[PDB]
UniProtKB/Swiss-Prot annotation, chain A:
Superkingdom of the organism of origin: Viruses
Protein name, as recorded: Spike protein S2
Role summary: Precursor of the fusion protein processed in the biosynthesis of the S protein and the formation of virus particle. Mediates fusion of the virion and cellular membranes by functioning as a class I viral fusion protein. Contains two viral fusion peptides that are unmasked after cleavage. The S2/S2' cleavage occurs during virus entry at the cell membrane by host TMPRSS2 or during endocytosis by host CSTL.
Glycan-linked positions: N1
Gene, per the UniProt record: S
Residues of the full protein shown: 717 to 765 of 1273
Disulfide bonds, paired cysteine numbers: C22-C44, C27-C33
Length: 49, 50
């Protein structure tokens, strides 16, 4: 005799995509923070890419 | 008589020394795209810039 049985299988596919910024997240509205990040250079443009 | 205001430009140089073309940063979305992608020719696609 033979019988048929079912089995579940769950694999994740993708997560929610998240994007951040250095201009707003690091400093709220102060232009001095922008001045220090611009004199220091590009540190998180590669992170954005 | 003209007026001058401070912003950033992007310039493309040549081996002879003389500049042959230039583009600004804030006049059009295409100009902002060229300013942020560090390139003149822009391929088709989605670009998160600012
Ligand atoms: C194989 O086994 C299944 C159960 O595991 C059998 O199905 C039942 O069979 C009995 C009698 O053999 C019936 O009274 C039940 O109503 C059946 N269950 C149902 C229809 O859900 C099946 O008959 C067996 N097959 C063989 C060839 O022996």
């Amino acid at each position: 005799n033979f019988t048929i049985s079912v089995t579940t299988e769950i694999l994740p596919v993708s997560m929610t995509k998240t994007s951040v910024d250095c201009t707003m997240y690091i400093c709220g509205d102060s232009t001095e923070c922008s001045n220090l990040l611009l004199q220091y250079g590009s540190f998180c443009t590669q992170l954005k890419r | 008589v003209g007026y001058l205001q401070p912003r950033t430009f992007l310039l493309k140089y040549n081996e002879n020394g003389t500049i042959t073309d230039a583009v600004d940063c804030a006049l059009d979305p295409l100009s902002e795209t060229k300013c942020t992608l560090k390139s003149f020719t822009v391929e088709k696609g989605i670009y998160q810039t600012s």
